[PDB]
Amino acid sequence: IVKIKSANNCISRYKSPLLFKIINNSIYLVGNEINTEILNKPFQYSYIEQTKNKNMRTGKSEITERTMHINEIEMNYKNRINYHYTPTSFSLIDFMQYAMSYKKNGKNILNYIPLK
RNA sequence: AUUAAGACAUUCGUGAGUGAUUUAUUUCCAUGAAGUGGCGU
Prior knowledge:
Blueprint: E1 2-6, E2 19-23, E3 26-30, E4 43-47, H1 77-80, H2 92-98
Antiparallel strand pairs: 1-4, 2-3
The structure holds one RNA strand.
């Protein structure tokens, strides 16, 4: 189990920028630009081992929590470009156009493009 | 023994009768029980 948490208590949640609109049995994928506040933000990872054991024949429950392995940490590695930081440059329109144009003998996400 | 003597400004009398601390005034305005899956590449 990898627990993800903001390095400082500044980011707690993020709604999916994409919105799915189902009208008259038709699927519409819509979206504005993402919230730029999440870009270039630090994130902290806490690894935890959970070994679901055999039932104790009395509770049949889980107490398999008291394990945690200490792996290596790479904070500020490569001048704060590592798996603790967000890509600091992203446009939802560009990625959405890149998707549903990726294909092999046919385009994967079978949606045509009425975009504004 | 002298134009003198005698004489309570006194008796009766409730500061009382009628009189709502009352007329009027919204414990309201704001806010998503909501965010998110992942491994099985």
